[PDB]
């Protein structure tokens, strides 16, 4: 299977697979069963912002999700990603719907990675920022139901022409270049990511969420990973 | 044929095909015959730095090459790259040797592209920085004789096991991700590139040069573009 | 007097001092009499974005102002700022009102300066970005009627508590740190700036405009520089 | 008294005042007695690199010091800097010598601060990078014996005309602009700092160390804070 690290914005409490019984943000290390969660007031129809930060020194993977009204949820988990992730990875966004649904609309997405060697000034870095997604976004690998160009937005899951979300959808966007996320010789490996999203559901309850993830370079949507699996895992192990 | 925009650090006067009779910096718009050149005193065995700068507002492509003792060569050329390059590109480094040779050693390579649209705050950006090239450097596409990892460097052309450069070599390094170099709705598209290089010819009779280039995404080294053609062009037209 | 370089967003045609007879963008080199202007459709009440770019290689100072509807005005002027500006400078925004008025509201402001030496990797850089201005913005020197903290915005000129603009107002905001804008030894000196603004007038015609400027470090509003003088010059010489 | 948060590269064990009995890296929260230290093998006459990293989400301040041969020391400490520093600060470098001495030579110094608020896209940022310090370097506040310009470096403490360091020296370099280190409404405040240093003791008996610090804006060198007090603290409490 793929190797996944993710920060999940999980809109739907799947308590059968260990979700807490509320919308929550979570840190997923090789399992959908968040090593750590925090309660999250997902505000239906509002533009939210997620920030993900890690460095190899502190070895603490941190995430915050906030809305303009100031409500914010945070989660941090101590993890040495050198021991989790392959040295080269891709990074992406993933979202799903199930039986319940929501738009999983990405308005913007940036990422910075840094690999600082002992050698003096010898930082390697990758940064990208998408504030506008075009129809044919060639630096983005779109997977599953992921489309771009739709209000300048990335729709990770299916939406109808009227902006109505479809259920049992999964989709992801990976940045095209492999990312060197750690290196033997590196003093500091550090990455941060930000994305802004608009999760809107006409249902009883929104589902299933958005995740920022780091995978093996050849990572693909696991079959069946709609719903609670968030486009990330083949199962709930 | 590929579409190439390049800045050439041309170490070998091929007067035969329109080079000036001295080592020079040149701007190459779809031809190895520079639209503009400037005399360049290549310092054998020294680390030089080339900067390349363009924005879509000023519509001037500028390049400078310097060495630590302060000596520098500059060339700039008015061109609207929107009329030249496709909307998506790859950017890269190329080098060649021919009858004569030199180390085409790249010690560092950074690049920033920005696309600032109309919509308000909607910059797309890419930036990468390589101060250290690794043996297997998955965000570079290595072409021809280009290799990475030998002293943390990118050797664009063949160097024998003892640091001794080889004739009739060509190699290139393209950043893996396509680059949105322009867009109709962008207010500003800008890019700048820096690389540091070590050109050493054991005889001080160097050939043929290094180039920063921008090409069609599927650019490959044209057949028999060693020597004066710098791995960029199929001929000297 | 101060030494001023500015990009003006000039909302009011003062043809007595050489303004073209329309709103225009302009490049001001030590005079309010733009060395170069372009017609500008200032859209009353809309959020506009100005981008200013220069580098020391191309020696072309470029500016674009755009609105979300895609209307954009550009101006570029060849100028070697090494010959204009002191080596250390401050950078800022300025705006004025006269007999006519407008809000001169700055929503955001960023600036990057870069000073790259021959010495290898030896960039100096300053970057700042204000997307939110607070009441007591200590990295900003506010001059004249300039206030911050008002919707998270910088109001360069007087506005009443109901957001109504006042005439015969001038104000500016300078970034606190001196900026090293050029250096003998530098291979590349380059700066860019962006700001977003909301110019709204209830009058017949808006006045007088917003400028991004670079001055001597001790620069202050010239007395009387409300109105067409834009907070920049003591007169129209 | 000033409020100091610092990372110390402490070259001289003052066991007397709680140093461990070896050269060490330390995190100093309002006291020269580090909350956390780590053993540091200072390499006489080599260029070392220190990285300091904090974000307000993870609430862990981490520092690493390395030398080109790969050897490195790391310390991290959970602290919420919002409860420690004022909202606005200056950031700087400090060094001292005492009975014993060393070059406290800074070759480069960069810093990034970000304040990411609630409002959507509303990052405030500051970044500066000094790879070259100039004789009159108007964006640094030089305090005590600190000087700039000698080999393009910042000598934090006195060095005789022949490169020979002096005892009982103190000096500091603060970036000129106040830094918005935190804000109540910010979702994320983060900062990171890097500097490269050359500590040379002709005898290999070095004292006293270099620190990266964050202080009240009006921080000055406390009286008799040469030696073990690193120009940071008025006493060793
Ligand atoms: C209750 O059934 C589920 O619906 C929720 C919301 O979609 C998902 O968590 C899950 O995987 C199924 O598809
Ligand atoms: C003399 O033949 C050439 O050698 C020079 C010097 O390398 C090149 O410019 C060229 O294309 C051929 O390979
Ligand atoms: C017509 O009088 C003027 O009003 C316009 C608009 O304010 C300004 O250009 C000028 O300086 C005076 O104050
Ligand atoms: C022995 O006296 C001290 O010298 C050492 C070594 O420099 C310092 O730590 C200290 O504060 C005094 O100056
Ligand atoms: Ca779930
Ligand atoms: Ca040639
Ligand atoms: Ca005017
Ligand atoms: Ca000590
Ligand atoms: Mn979950
Ligand atoms: Mn040529
Ligand atoms: Mn004018
Ligand atoms: Mn100590």
Author numbering:
A (entry chain A), B (entry chain S), C (entry chain A), D (entry chain S): 1 to 237
Sentences from the paper on this structure:
We report here the crystal structure of a native and complexed lectin isolated from Canavalia gladiata seeds, describing a new binding pocket in ConA-like lectins, which may be related to pathogen resistance, a site where a non-protein amino acid, such as α-amino butyric acid, can bind. The most recent accepted definition establishes lectins as proteins with at least one non-catalytic domain able to recognize and bind reversibly to specific mono and oligosaccharides. The oligomeric structures of CGL and CGL-αMM involve two 'canonical' dimers, and these dimers are associated by salt bridges between β-strands. In both CGL crystal structures, the amino acids involved in metal binding are conserved.
